[PDB]
Design a protein around this ligand. Structure first.
Ligand code: HEM
Length: 402
């Protein structure tokens, strides 16, 4: 009855359906045969996300304290990440979130609109005009979040060419494991240089702001700042890309809704929010452990067991959005907002940033290429082999009728 999560993501929607069916708490198996629990219903997910009994501390994981976890387990990196706001809870977590929130603010994001608009137009200018097939992901969606975050972080523009090469290697599924590790260090090198540069000469960027953040004398250490910058790249690059990609796929497959937005009858923000609910870029999130036995519906998560949050599956929970939860409809009016950015203390601090990027990129893209459409059947689109993410291999499209 256990549900094996396909690492090659050959059937995301089918898997999500099975997960909801086996919800609220579904017994699942992670790539490599590692069993864990997964909350697959909206209501139950929010409850656990705010339950102090479910912590990030990997030490609470029974199978962990033992030898049930293969040292070569591919997903070990997501299960046991480096120190950051991601690996802690309670007071330690509140400290990091409050300090970071003084830097990555709503205001800072609003003030990035102009720059995001400029980068978007620059990337659109680079798109071919021949009328042939173009991979909108590689040529538009992928590079945007990279340049935006670099600008936000205050990374020296002369380092961009190298940053691009590093990003390519770091996120490429074909990069040798050892090379990925080496690349992460060079990225850390650029981040550290940035922190050193801003300490030497403060400016109006996110790094300078992270340096200056303070709580009655308390502040972020160089290590905490660097781990935060690294986490923002790890958590916000591919997600933002997929948000843009999935939005284009959804509009392409729902003509009447695309029309509503192009005519101005529907807002672009509705495209973004429905895309986050219906096709979130983050299908599953590792990982939490029960410090004590925790009741979930008719079942119970034994103390020491693991729990992943299946945002992809619960996004279409009919108990939260009614009968039409199984389809894309940006005109819906549910009594429950989606929780694709999480819920509770660990709620995504990049929600405003991603919404701003997609909110600028999508309108600009369609204003210039109003007739853009998929160059292949939607069914022919495929996911990248990353079990926790909903990223497409590519986005073949024809910008205009050739
Ligand atoms: C629309 C694209 C995005 C989605 C769907 C998304 C989703 C999420 C979710 C679901 C979580 C929490 C997982 C859990 O606790 O169960 C999270 C955490 C996080 N996200 Fe995002 N995210 C997106 C973009 C970004 C961006 C652009 C950034 C960079 C500022 C970012 C930075 C983070 C960080 C730092 C955390 C850790 C929060 C913590 O553990 O305290 N995210 N995100």
């Amino acid at each position: 009855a256990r549900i094996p999560l396909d690492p090659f993501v050959t059937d995301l929607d089918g898997e999500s359906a099975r997960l909801r069916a086996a919800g609220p708490l579904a017994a699942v198996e992670l790539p490599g045969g590692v069993p864990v629990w997964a909350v697959t219903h909206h209501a139950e997910a929010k409850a656990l996300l705010t339950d102090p009994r479910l912590v990030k501390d990997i030490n609470v994981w029974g199978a962990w304290r033992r030898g049930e976890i293969p040292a070569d387990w591919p997903l070990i990196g997501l299960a046991n990440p480096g120190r950051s706001m991601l690996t802690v809870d309670g007071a330690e977590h509140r400290r990091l979130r409050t300090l970071v929130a003084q830097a990555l603010t709503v205001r800072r994001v609003e003030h990035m609109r102009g720059r995001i608009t400029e980068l978007t137009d620059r990337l659109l200018d680079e798109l071919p005009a021949d009328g042939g097939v173009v991979d909108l992901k590689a040529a538009f969606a992928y590079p945007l979040p990279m340049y935006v975050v670099a600008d936000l972080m205050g990374i020296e523009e002369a380092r961009l060419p190298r940053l691009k090469v590093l990003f390519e290697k770091f996120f490429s599924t074909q990069t040798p494991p050892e090379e990925v590790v080496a690349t992460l260090t060079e990225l850390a090198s650029i981040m550290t240089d940035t922190v050193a540069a801003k300490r030497a000469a403060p400016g109006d960027d996110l790094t300078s702001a992270l340096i200056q953040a303070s709580e009655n004398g308390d502040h972020l250490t160089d290590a905490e700042i660097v781990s935060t910058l690294q986490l923002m790249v790890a958590a916000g690059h591919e997600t933002t890309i997929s948000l843009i990609v999935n939005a284009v796929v959804n509009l392409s497959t729902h003509p009447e809704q695309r029309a509503l937005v192009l005519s101005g009858e529907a807002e672009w923000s509705a495209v973004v929010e429905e895309t986050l609910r219906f096709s979130t870029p983050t299908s599953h999130v590792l990982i939490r452990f029960a410090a004590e036995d925790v009741p979930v519906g008719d079942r119970v998560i034994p103390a020491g067991d693991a729990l992943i949050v299946s945002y992809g599956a619960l996004g279409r929970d009919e108990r939260a959005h009614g009968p039409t939860a199984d389809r894309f409809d940006l005109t819906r009016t549910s009594g429950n907002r989606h929780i694709s950015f999480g819920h509770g203390p660990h709620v995504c601090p990049g929600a405003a940033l991603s919404r701003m990027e997609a909110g600028v990129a999508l309108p600009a893209l369609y204003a210039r290429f109003p007739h853009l459409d998929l160059a292949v059947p939607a069914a022919e689109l495929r996911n990248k082999p990353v079990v926790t993410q909903n990223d497409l291999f590519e986005l073949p499209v024809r910008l205009a009728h050739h």
